[PDB]
Amino acid sequence: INYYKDAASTSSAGQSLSMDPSKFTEPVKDLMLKGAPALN
Amino acid sequence: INYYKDAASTSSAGQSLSMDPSKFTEPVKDLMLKGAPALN
Amino acid sequence: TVASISSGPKHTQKVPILTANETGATMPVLPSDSIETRTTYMHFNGSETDVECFLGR
Amino acid sequence: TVASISSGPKHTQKVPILTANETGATMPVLPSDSIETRTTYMHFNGSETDVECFLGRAACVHVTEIQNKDATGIDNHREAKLFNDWKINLSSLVQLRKKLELFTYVRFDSEYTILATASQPDSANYSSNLVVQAMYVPPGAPNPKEWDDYTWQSASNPSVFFKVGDTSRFSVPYVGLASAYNYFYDGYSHDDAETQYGITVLNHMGSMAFRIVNEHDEHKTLVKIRVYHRAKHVEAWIPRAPRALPYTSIGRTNYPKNTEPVIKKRKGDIKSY
Amino acid sequence: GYSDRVQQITLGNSTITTQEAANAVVCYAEWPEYLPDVDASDVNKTSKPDTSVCRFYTLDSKTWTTGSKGWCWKLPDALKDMGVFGQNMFFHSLGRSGYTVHVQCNATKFHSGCLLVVVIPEHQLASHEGGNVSVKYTFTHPGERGIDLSSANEVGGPVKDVLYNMNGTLLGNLLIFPHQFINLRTNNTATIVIPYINSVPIDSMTRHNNVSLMVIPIAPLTVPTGATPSLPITVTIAPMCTEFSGIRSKSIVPQ
Amino acid sequence: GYSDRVQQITLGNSTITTQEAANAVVCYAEWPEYLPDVDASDVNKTSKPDTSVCRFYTLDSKTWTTGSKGWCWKLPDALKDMGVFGQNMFFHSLGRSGYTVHVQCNATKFHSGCLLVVVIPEHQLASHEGGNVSVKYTFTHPGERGIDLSSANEVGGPVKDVLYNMNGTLLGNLLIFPHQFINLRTNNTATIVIPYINSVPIDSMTRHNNVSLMVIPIAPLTVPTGATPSLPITVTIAPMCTEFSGIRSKSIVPQ
Amino acid sequence: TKDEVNSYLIPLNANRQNEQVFGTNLFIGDGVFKTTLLGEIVQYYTHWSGSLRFSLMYT
Amino acid sequence: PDTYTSAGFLSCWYQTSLILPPETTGQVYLLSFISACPDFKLRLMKDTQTISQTVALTE
């Protein structure tokens, strides 16, 4: 129950439960498959 | 939920969301169209 | 809500920027009447300028 | 969810453990690519590492102090700590600062808690009960000059009145001018040859002025204000390397000269355990 | 017969071929794109010179020697004088751009050495003075020359200490930023595509640089016996999806 | 209430309003348009800076006095230094453009005078020396200053005799070219839209001017009694549908 | 030097050519703008965004 | 007024020049107005520097 009118006044947000490290761990242009050779 | 009986005791009103500047910006008797000459 | 529409070159007989202020009106001229604009949205309602808000603290 | 699958002997032409790090990727290698594993489940979600959780607890962001005393003959209230302002910041006490600067741009609502306690360091008959006034002074508002100016009327400026010993709590929406806040900014306010670098006006979260509403009693009373800040509704972009050297200034990246080695030297060889 | 190894990038009227690449990085897995209306604020129609600005400019070459500490360029600064890109830059109030960065360094199978090529969004430098000394404008706008981390401290300039990234963080952790290594034994180029990253939809190109490109020797250069002890490093960079807006008189900037 | 008389032209980030126009001429009844593929030869994609080059540049003002003979500007020369139009010009090998020309001269209902405003495609000037003396480059590239037909013969310059249009034809017949009069009693501006006219699809902007704009007093200026005897004439011109192609190093031209 | 009806009037000189009639920066919360209704309201708020309409009536 | 946040300049020049009819003389004036387009946004209310006081008023 929100007792207040504005959105800033609500409690903390709830877990992204998004999670996708590939923008950080695999930003390569041509896709690399694990097990296939790195450099062909 | 109002806890009180009288109307003065309720919280602030809620946004007019009315908004019509023409009583102030265009109080002319004969309607002016933008693009048409001001004085004919 | 659009804050500005897209508008391009103009070569008209219809000039929205020439007016006669002696009339007492403020003609509703916009950026797109005199330069070439691109679309943009307002993203805003004018909530905090409502008189209830202005006199309500 | 499985944390590890079962995997047995391998004799392949398909080697997942040989890679080329020059590419910039971190290939997702697992225990089961190089030893024989058994199934196990995660039993865990990673709840408490969510950025909302990481930045979402109150941190002390500021300690100031004001006193209640006879202002009679004081030529400069501000200077007597008759009242005091604070331009809001999150980079003056380092604990929260290092946490925020793990990210480049950050967007959140703030919840402030203000604790005020009183001290009476010299002989008093009693402890008086003072009410503090905290005014939020956005840039362009008249700033208080005396502890009882017209400014304190605060007819258009949000202000909270609470008692010393108590706590005040309110929450302010994200007041940034841009879409997020840049705790880093590799720019200037204009192309001036001598303008300041790094410190910008899009990390301004306003500013706050404190005073005691009470007139003076016979003794003097020291009131010390602690402002706590909790981020709620957090959004963070672009992770960066954590801060290694100590901080020297609000808003610049500068570290102190003749600082000490930050990497612990081995007591022994490279070969040592 | 496609290898990760050979590549061709054609952009405008200019083409680059590498026969010894190590894939390419696209920052944060996003490719440069123009500014959508839903994200727009300024009402001005923007100018998109296209092929006259989105081509490859090769900056002047550096020389890696055994004593090198590393070099640093800022964008869009490094290009402030390249062809029509630069003119547009000084003439509009606001502009926006992504880039393709191609760093080149070839040697032989007897050399060793490894450079880190990294892009840091919003790289705010530190003053070597400490305290709250600022870093003057000119110092953070070296132009095509870039900053040479093995040059001496100057007054009003930034600190040039490599183990600290010019900001109080350790060299070792720069790997959290989009980056690629050039290991003479593997690699001979590094290519990174940079999407436009800012907290505003479009900004000023002169008062704010939005990425520093940094090339840092990490495993020292080691040449074969009686080889000349140095290799040149060349940086070629191409603006991509550039847009300029708010045209007028032509900025005048310090120094 | 639309009159032939009032008009607004908005082009780029600039707008012109006239409350005393006399219609507008569109050369040969054709409006500027880009270069179609069917007509193309150079294989290069062209650059269309759009709003950054297609706006109105106002050249410096002239002063009509009772002794004036007339002035002459060449295009694209007159604009060789205006904003990004000019940069593009020196930086590409080829370019193409149409223009809107707006000539302004206001007075009062007591003045008299009438100017001819005419656009001449391929106006090859004559040497005042006769014979086969050429007219040097600099002389036919006056820039924004234009040529002042009442200035003195110079050496290597063109002839400036008005009854002969600077080429051996009579002033009276200039009316076969797109033109408009400014008759103080009627008119206060002249506007001509110029489509691109050439025998090749695109050309060099520096070695060849494709139109001369000419403003010539024909009925002498006559001011009311004890009025100052002169009026300023202003020329504002806007490139329209401009395209540049074959970008490179940046031309260096005489003088 | 003292408020007068005359500071609302921008003067124009006959026969000058090429020259400048007036100049001002656009800090709507200060300077010329500051006492106007727009200026006066803007001052009740911290941030503004939007287009302005500046018109000149000739007399 | 703030730098980073600054909005530009507004200037006005003779394009050709003012010309008075016979029997007429002197300066002419322009009146200038300002208003906001429908585009406009204002936010985060605060107190105006345009009004202050030193003692409470009375009747």
From Swiss-Prot, chain C:
Q: Which residues cross the membrane?
A: none
Subcellular location(s) of the protein: Virion; Host cytoplasm
Domain of life according to the entry: Viruses
| Quaternary structure (record) | Interacts with capsid protein VP0, and capsid protein VP3 to form heterotrimeric protomers. Five protomers subsequently associate to form pentamers which serve as building blocks for the capsid. Interacts with capsid protein VP2, capsid protein VP3 and capsid protein VP4 following cleavage of capsid protein VP0. Interacts with host ICAM1.
Q: What does this protein do?
A: Forms an icosahedral capsid of pseudo T=3 symmetry with capsid proteins VP2 and VP3. The capsid is 300 Angstroms in diameter, composed of 60 copies of each capsid protein and enclosing the viral positive strand RNA genome. Capsid protein VP1 mainly forms the vertices of the capsid. Capsid protein VP1 interacts with host ICAM1 to provide virion attachment to target host cells. This attachment induces virion internalization. Tyrosine kinases are probably involved in the entry process. After binding to its receptor, the capsid undergoes conformational changes.
Name of protein: Capsid protein VP1
Part of the intact protein present: 584 to 640 of 2179
Swiss-Prot record, chain G:
Q: Where in the cell is it found?
A: Virion; Host cytoplasm
Q: Which domain of life is it from?
A: Viruses
Q: Which residues cross the membrane?
A: none
The entry describes its oligomerization and partners as: Interacts with capsid protein VP0 and capsid protein VP1 to form heterotrimeric protomers. Five protomers subsequently associate to form pentamers which serve as building blocks for the capsid. Interacts with capsid protein VP4 in the mature capsid. Interacts with protein 2C; this interaction may be important for virion morphogenesis.
Function (record text): Forms an icosahedral capsid of pseudo T=3 symmetry with capsid proteins VP2 and VP3. The capsid is 300 Angstroms in diameter, composed of 60 copies of each capsid protein and enclosing the viral positive strand RNA genome.
Q: What is this protein called?
A: Capsid protein VP3
Q: Which organism is it from?
A: Human rhinovirus 14
Report which part of the complete sequence is shown: 391 to 449 of 2179
